[PDB]
Design an enzyme around this catalytic site. Structure first.
Site, PDB file in Angstrom:
ATOM      1  N   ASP A 170       7.868  10.311  -8.283  1.00 22.36           N
ATOM      2  CA  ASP A 170       6.960  11.287  -7.648  1.00 22.36           C
ATOM      3  C   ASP A 170       7.289  12.774  -7.817  1.00 22.36           C
ATOM      4  O   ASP A 170       6.980  13.582  -6.942  1.00 22.36           O
ATOM      5  CB  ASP A 170       6.751  10.956  -6.160  1.00 22.36           C
ATOM      6  CG  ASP A 170       5.832   9.776  -5.953  1.00 22.36           C
ATOM      7  OD1 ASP A 170       4.747   9.743  -6.580  1.00 22.36           O
ATOM      8  OD2 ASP A 170       6.195   8.880  -5.158  1.00 22.36           O
TER       9      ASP A 170
ATOM     10  N   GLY B 182       0.755  -1.260   0.000  1.00 17.16           N
ATOM     11  CA  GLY B 182       0.000   0.000   0.000  1.00 17.16           C
ATOM     12  C   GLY B 182       0.780   1.302   0.000  1.00 17.16           C
ATOM     13  O   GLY B 182       0.199   2.369  -0.198  1.00 17.16           O
ATOM     14  N   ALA B 183       2.094   1.214   0.215  1.00 18.91           N
ATOM     15  CA  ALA B 183       2.964   2.396   0.318  1.00 18.91           C
ATOM     16  C   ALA B 183       3.083   3.206  -0.979  1.00 18.91           C
ATOM     17  O   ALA B 183       3.447   4.384  -0.950  1.00 18.91           O
ATOM     18  CB  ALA B 183       4.351   2.002   0.829  1.00 18.91           C
TER      19      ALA B 183
ATOM     20  N   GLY C  13       0.447   2.787  -3.373  1.00 20.35           N
ATOM     21  CA  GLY C  13      -0.929   2.777  -3.866  1.00 20.35           C
ATOM     22  C   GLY C  13      -1.324   1.410  -4.390  1.00 20.35           C
ATOM     23  O   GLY C  13      -0.806   0.384  -3.930  1.00 20.35           O
ATOM     24  N   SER C  14      -2.254   1.397  -5.346  1.00 25.97           N
ATOM     25  CA  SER C  14      -2.640   0.173  -6.040  1.00 25.97           C
ATOM     26  C   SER C  14      -1.636  -0.135  -7.151  1.00 25.97           C
ATOM     27  O   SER C  14      -1.853   0.202  -8.318  1.00 25.97           O
ATOM     28  CB  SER C  14      -4.059   0.286  -6.603  1.00 25.97           C
ATOM     29  OG  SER C  14      -5.022  -0.074  -5.629  1.00 25.97           O
TER      30      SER C  14
HETATM   31  O1  LIG Z   1       6.388   8.467  -9.873  1.00 20.85           O
HETATM   32  C1  LIG Z   1       5.285   8.238 -10.373  1.00 20.85           C
HETATM   33  N1  LIG Z   1       4.379   9.174 -10.685  1.00 20.85           N
HETATM   34  C2  LIG Z   1       4.582  10.617 -10.459  1.00 20.85           C
HETATM   35  C3  LIG Z   1       5.738  11.253 -11.237  1.00 20.85           C
HETATM   36  C4  LIG Z   1       4.300  11.524 -11.665  1.00 20.85           C
HETATM   37  C5  LIG Z   1       4.879   6.791 -10.696  1.00 20.85           C
HETATM   38  C6  LIG Z   1       3.636   6.499 -11.260  1.00 20.85           C
HETATM   39  C7  LIG Z   1       3.298   5.176 -11.547  1.00 20.85           C
HETATM   40  C8  LIG Z   1       4.202   4.142 -11.274  1.00 20.85           C
HETATM   41 CL1  LIG Z   1       3.739   2.516 -11.653  1.00 20.85          CL
HETATM   42  C9  LIG Z   1       5.455   4.433 -10.717  1.00 20.85           C
HETATM   43  N2  LIG Z   1       6.348   3.469 -10.454  1.00 20.85           N
HETATM   44  C10 LIG Z   1       6.537   2.981  -9.218  1.00 20.85           C
HETATM   45  N3  LIG Z   1       5.796   3.430  -8.176  1.00 20.85           N
HETATM   46  N4  LIG Z   1       5.932   3.007  -7.017  1.00 20.85           N
HETATM   47  C11 LIG Z   1       6.820   2.072  -6.685  1.00 20.85           C
HETATM   48  C12 LIG Z   1       7.644   1.536  -7.673  1.00 20.85           C
HETATM   49  C13 LIG Z   1       7.504   1.997  -8.968  1.00 20.85           C
HETATM   50  C14 LIG Z   1       8.401   1.323  -9.690  1.00 20.85           C
HETATM   51  N5  LIG Z   1       9.048   0.493  -8.863  1.00 20.85           N
HETATM   52  N6  LIG Z   1       8.609   0.619  -7.710  1.00 20.85           N
HETATM   53  C15 LIG Z   1       9.044  -0.074  -6.648  1.00 20.85           C
HETATM   54  C16 LIG Z   1       8.499  -1.328  -6.352  1.00 20.85           C
HETATM   55  F1  LIG Z   1       7.532  -1.839  -7.130  1.00 20.85           F
HETATM   56  C17 LIG Z   1       8.946  -2.062  -5.250  1.00 20.85           C
HETATM   57  C18 LIG Z   1       9.946  -1.541  -4.432  1.00 20.85           C
HETATM   58  C19 LIG Z   1      10.490  -0.287  -4.720  1.00 20.85           C
HETATM   59  C20 LIG Z   1      10.044   0.439  -5.823  1.00 20.85           C
HETATM   60  F2  LIG Z   1      10.580   1.644  -6.087  1.00 20.85           F
HETATM   61  C21 LIG Z   1       5.784   5.760 -10.434  1.00 20.85           C
END
Ligand SMILES: O=C(NC1CC1)c1ccc(Cl)c(Nc2nncc3c2cnn3-c2c(F)cccc2F)c1
EC number: 2.7.11.24
Length: 357
Positions: free
Chosen positions: A172, A37-38, A40-41
């Site tokens: 982000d 959940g950290a 999101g979905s």
């Molecule tokens: O930064 C984003 N959006 C803002 C800039 C406009 C954004 C949007 C959609 C997606 Cl799918 C992502 N990608 C990702 N989002 N969270 C975690 C993520 C990740 C890619 N890898 N990981 C990840 C994991 F899955 C396990 C452990 C560590 C990790 F960093 C980023």
């Protein structure tokens, strides 16, 4: 010069994973929830077309309000713009919807990363070379982000994603929107923020992100949060203890009368000796740290300038540190209805052209 006249729609399959039904193209297999959940979905998946491990984020009901609809459009526009090794970018974006009328779900696809900086720090003790390569990559990506005239605004270890080979992507950027409560007390959410945004001294710009890199770099070197304030005011005192109180020249740049009034009430302190603060650290690391952690934002080193710093000698390549195209954010000052943000979002989804990977 040949031209594509229409777009093929892939076959989609349905699957219940995050207590929600995920509908994704066949190419994406072995969907598995990540991050508890950290993030999101988000599901980890294998993209059979490219052979890439991928992260797929589902935005369900993203057009619930004017704010949410505009935020959905903002995130997509942001991700579509970034084509850089050290910046998270868009591998794909899709909806199972066949028309604008039935369109109420957006799925985003990025590279899958192994961990964020927070988690790799608890698993390892980082050498100076690790810190060199990690900070080089943050700065390399920031040069690119900043050249597009985008500010991250919220750079912290938790949105720096890292792989087993120590390769880094910035997550982000340009979209962090925090409540007052989230920024209150003894919280990591505020520890990396530049003094001028933390207390709203003036209209902020990209130089805000360099302050954050300084805080991250120091923490990687020492193993300790640099400014872990128990509140906004306690944090500021920590900051001024290290970097000194504002001089006359910076005081008149502080557009906020009340903030200027509070500053002038504080006992004046000189900048500390960083060599006595960061004992045992690479003297070049300490030097760069001094050029990042400058109170006056105008006088901070920029990302492009820091890349040329002697600390990154073994990684610096001026022919492989690219800039971006300009990012058109004119939509930010635009007031529109929900259906207009939704249509704009739909346009961006269907117009997406995949990378040549
Ligand atoms: O930064 C984003 N959006 C803002 C800039 C406009 C954004 C949007 C959609 C997606 Cl799918 C992502 N990608 C990702 N989002 N969270 C975690 C993520 C990740 C890619 N890898 N990981 C990840 C994991 F899955 C396990 C452990 C560590 C990790 F960093 C980023």
């Amino acid at each position: 010069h040949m031209l594509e006249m229409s777009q093929e729609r892939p076959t989609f399959y349905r699957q219940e994973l995050n207590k929600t039904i995920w509908e994704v193209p066949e190419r994406y297999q072995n969907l598995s929830p990540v991050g508890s959940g950290a993030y999101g979905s988000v599901c980890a998946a294998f993209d059979t077309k490219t052979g890439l491990r991928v992260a797929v984020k589902k935005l369900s009901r993203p057009f619930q309000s004017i704010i949410h609809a505009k935020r959905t459009y903002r995130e997509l526009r942001l991700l579509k713009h970034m084509k850089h090794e050290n910046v998270i970018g868009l591998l794909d974006v899709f909806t199972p919807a066949r028309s604008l009328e039935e369109f109420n779900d957006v799925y985003l696809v990025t590279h899958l990363m192994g961990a964020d900086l927070n988690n790799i720090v608890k698993c390892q003790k980082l050498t100076d070379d690790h810190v060199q390569f990690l900070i080089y990559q943050i700065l390399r990506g920031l040069k690119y982000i900043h050249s597009a005239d985008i500010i991250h605004r919220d750079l912290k270890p938790s949105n720096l994603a890292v792989n087993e080979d120590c390769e880094l992507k910035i997550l982000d950027f340009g979209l962090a929107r925090h409540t007052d409560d989230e920024m209150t007390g003894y919280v990591a959410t505020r520890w990396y923020r530049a003094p001028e945004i933390m207390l709203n001294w003036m209209h902020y710009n990209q130089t805000v992100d360099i302050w954050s890199v300084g805080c991250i770099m120091a923490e990687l070197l020492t193993g300790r949060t640099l400014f872990p304030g128990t509140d906004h005011i306690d944090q500021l005192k920590l900051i001024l203890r290290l970097v000194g109180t504002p001089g006359a020249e910076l005081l008149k740049k502080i557009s906020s009368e009340s903030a200027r009034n509070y500053i002038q009430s504080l006992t004046q302190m000189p900048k500390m000796n960083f060599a006595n603060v960061f004992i045992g650290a690479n003297p070049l690391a300490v030097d760069l740290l001094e050029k990042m952690l400058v109170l006056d934002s105008d006088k901070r080193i920029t990302a492009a300038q820091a890349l040329a710093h002697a600390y990154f000698a073994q990684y610096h390549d001026p022919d492989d540190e690219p800039v971006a195209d300009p990012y058109d954010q004119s939509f930010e000052s635009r007031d529109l209805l929900i259906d207009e943000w939704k249509s704009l979002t739909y346009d961006e989804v269907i117009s997406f052209v995949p990378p040549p990977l």
